[PDB]
Design a protein around this nucleic acid. Sequence first.
RNA 1: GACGACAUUAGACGAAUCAUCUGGAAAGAUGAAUCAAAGAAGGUAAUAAUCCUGUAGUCGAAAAUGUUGUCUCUCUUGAGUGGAUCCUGAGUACGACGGAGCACGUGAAAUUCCGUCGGAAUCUGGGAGGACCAUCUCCUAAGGCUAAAUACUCUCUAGUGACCGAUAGUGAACCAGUACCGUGAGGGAAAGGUGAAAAGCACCCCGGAAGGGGAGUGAAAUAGAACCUGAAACCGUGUGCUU
RNA 2: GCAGUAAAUGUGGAGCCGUAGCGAAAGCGAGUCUGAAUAGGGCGUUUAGUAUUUGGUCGUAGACCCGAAACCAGGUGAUCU
RNA 3: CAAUGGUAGGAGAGCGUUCUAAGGGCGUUGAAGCAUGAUCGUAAGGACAUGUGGAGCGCUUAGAAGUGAGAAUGCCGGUGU
Lengths: 206, 58, 64, 146
Amino acid sequence: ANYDVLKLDGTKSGSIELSDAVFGIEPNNSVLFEAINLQRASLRQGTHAVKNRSAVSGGGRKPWKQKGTGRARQGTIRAPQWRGGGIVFGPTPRSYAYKMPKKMRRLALRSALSFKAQENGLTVVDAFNFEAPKTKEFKNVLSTLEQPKKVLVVTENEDVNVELSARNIPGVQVTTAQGLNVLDITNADSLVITEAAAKKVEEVLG
Amino acid sequence: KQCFVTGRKASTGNRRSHALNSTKRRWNANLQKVRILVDGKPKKVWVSARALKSGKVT
Amino acid sequence: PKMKTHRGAAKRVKRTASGQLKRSRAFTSHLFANKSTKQKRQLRKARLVSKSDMKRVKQLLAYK
Amino acid sequence: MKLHELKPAEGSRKERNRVGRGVATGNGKTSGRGHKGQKARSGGGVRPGFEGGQLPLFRRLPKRGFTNINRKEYAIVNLDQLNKFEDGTEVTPALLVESGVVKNEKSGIKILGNGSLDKKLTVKAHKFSASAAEAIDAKGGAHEVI
RNA sequence: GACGACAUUAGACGAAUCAUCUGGAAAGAUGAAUCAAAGAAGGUAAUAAUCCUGUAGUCGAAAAUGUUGUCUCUCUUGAGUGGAUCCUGAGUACGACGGAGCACGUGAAAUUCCGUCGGAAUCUGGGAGGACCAUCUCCUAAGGCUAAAUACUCUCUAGUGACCGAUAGUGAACCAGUACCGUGAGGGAAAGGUGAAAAGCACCCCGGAAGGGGAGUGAAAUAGAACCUGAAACCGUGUGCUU
RNA sequence: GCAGUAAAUGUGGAGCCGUAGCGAAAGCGAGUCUGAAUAGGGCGUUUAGUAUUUGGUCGUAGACCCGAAACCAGGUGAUCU
RNA sequence: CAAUGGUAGGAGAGCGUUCUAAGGGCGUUGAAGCAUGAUCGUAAGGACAUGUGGAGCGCUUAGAAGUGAGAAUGCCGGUGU
C-alpha cells in the first residue's frame, strides 16, 4: 500500500499508495510461467531450413538397374541413406509464437509486479530530471539508491536523457510505463519507478 | 489463317461422346478466298462468310 | 489445411442434443409389395447411429 | 519467481513419446504399428469410413430433407434472464444487447418462458411465446410487439 | 531551364589503464584507477569498455546520379432552365447447333465466351435481380485511359539467426559445373586446419638419391611441411602366465 | 488491421462457440415431432461453458525410411548398326 | 500382508547428446577430446586419479530438437582374408 518516495539522493520525500489489486496480489506462478515462456518464444526467429530429396542438386537417374548386379536396389544418388543426400524431416522455416487470453496477460504483469513488491525491490522515486546524457551520473543515482547489479528503471513516457544515460551501465535496462514486459521485470532484481509512472501503471494494470 | 476483316480465327474445345469421353477438337471459321479492295490495289485474302453477310466489296 | 466434411453424409444425418446423430432408415425405397405393413410403419421412424459405427465415422461429421 | 529457479505448473507439461528408438522404450522395432498390412506402411491406413469394400454406412442410408435458404431464427432470451433488469423498466432488442444478454441478434428477438419474473415491467421485442406473454402480464406490464 | 532542399557513389574526427604474478606470450589472476550519448563487433602471442580497427555522437563531398519545394512553363468556361424535334457505340445484343467457362459435371440452369447459321429496339427505348415471367427495384452494354494498397528477388547496401560447422552447410569453404564419363543432350566428384612469428631445420655424420641420426629454431619438431588433436579395424616388436 | 523492437503488449467485437430444443420444412418452444388424439412412442428439458497451451490420436499434405515393371511432356543421337 | 515370466501392444517413471535463457562456477598452476585404471548407482549411465592435449567447458532450473544404430544384398571412407 504505502511505499516511501525517495529523492535521487535517497532521502525520503513523500509517500504514495499503490493498490493491492496491482502491486499486492498473490502471484500465480502458473500464469507467470506461461507468460514468460510465451515471450521467450516470440523472440525466436525460426530461420532454420535444410534440403530434402527434392532440393539436393541432381539425382534423377536410377543409379543402376534393379536386378542383376548384386548391389542393393537404389533409385537416386540423393536418397537419405546416401552420403550427400536429402534430409528426412529436419528443420523447416516456421514461427514459434502463440497467444494467451487477455486477462491472463494482465495477471502475469501484476504477478511479476507483486512478486517484486514482496521481495522489497520496488523503489518509487519522485522524478529523475536529468538534463543531459551523462553515464557517470546515472551510476551515481543507482549507487546512492543502493540498487542491485540488476535494475530496471521505469520512466513516465520516453525519457531520452535517462535512456541515453543507462544504455551503457552494464545490467540496467530503461522502459516506459506502457512497455513493461514480464521477462524484463522478472530478470530485474530491483525496480525504480517514477511516481508518475507508478500512478500510470496502477491505472492501466487495474 | 484469320479473317482479314474481323479476325474470326480457329478455336479449340472438346469432342464429347455419349459417355462424356473427351477428345480435343477445333472450330475453324468459314473462311473464303475473295478478291476485295485492300490498300488500294485489289487482293485475294481469306474473309469469313459472316463478314460477307453484309459489308464487303468483291 | 481446414479439414473437410463428408458432404455425402451431411445430407443423411441430423445432429441431436446429446451428440447423437439421427439417421433415416434403410429398405424404404421400393419393393413394398414384398414387405409387411408392420415393417413399413416401423420403418417410418428415425433411429440413432450405433456406437460401433460412430467410432468409425466421428470425424466425417465433426462440423455438424 | 526468479528466472533461474522457475517451475512449470504441476502436471501441465509432459514429455512426448519418441518412437522407434531402442527396444527398452517399448515401441522399438515396429514403432507400435504391428508387423504387416496397410497399417504397418508409411502413409498407410485406410480412408475414414471405408469398410473393406462393404457398402459404407452413408450409402446404405437415404438422404432426406432440404434447407429453407431463408430462415427466421432469433436470438432467444428466457424468462428468468429478464430478472437481471428491474421493475417497471423497458426491455428492447438493443437493451438486450447493451446488458450483454444477447450477443448476435440473428433475425430478431424471441421471448420464451422458463423461469419467473419476480418483477413488474413492460417490454418490447420482435416475437413472443404464449407462456412468455402470459407471464409478463400476470405480474403486470405490457409487451409492445415491434 | 532554374533555383533551392535532404538523402547516396569517396571519406573525417571520435572518451578512458597502470602495476605485479604465472607464462613462450597475458586480455587471465591480484591490487589500485578511469571513461561511457561509446560495455555492438572484430583483431591482438591467452579470456580487453580504457592496445588496435572501430562503436555512440558529430562532420563531410569536385563530380555523375535517383528524389523533392517552388518559380516558371504549358494548357482552359463555368452554370441553370425548358424540352418541340434530334442524338446516345449493329451484323451488335440475342436466339438455334456444337463446345468451353462459371465452386455449379446440361441440369429447372440463370450469369458469360468461342466456332456455325439466323438476327432486334432506338427513351413513348434497352439490360439485370439464378427456369422464369407480370409488377416493382437497380442500372444504361456493345469505344478508351487510369496511380495506391498486391506478387517476386538475378542484384546492391546494412543487419539478424535455441541455422550448419568440412560424410554438415551450396554440387562447389580449396582456381567446381572443374577432374572425370558420354557421340551428344546430359551426368558429375574428391579434396580446409604447421607455428605466435617461417623463425621452414647453418653445419656435421651414413647414403647415388630418398630417407635418417645428431647439433640448432621453437613453449612444443611423435608441431618438420602428407605438418593441430590422432580413436577403431589392421600390421608389427618385446615379453609375465599358459599350451 | 493499426501502433510497437521482425518482442511482450495495447487496441480492434466482423466473427466464433455457449446460454434450447424439436421437426424434412412452414413453424412451435421446455417442449417438439408423429398422429384424428387430451393416447402412446422418438428426441429433448435436472445449466457449464469457453479461450490458450502440454500430451495421445486422426484428417490434408511425399507424412516413418529405402526400393519397382512402368506412364506422360521437351530435348540428343544413323561416327555402331 | 499381498504382488513382480512375458511377444503384438497400452500405461508410467527416467538416463543420455546439441543448442538457448537465467543463476552460479571451472580453466596454460592446463579446457574439450583421446588412453588407461582394481571406482559409484537398480538400469539407461555418473565421477575420480594418472598420461597425451594446447583452449575452451562444466553445474542448477527451465525451455527447444537434425537426440541415442547392429543388421535395410544400406551410402562414404579406411583395413583385412
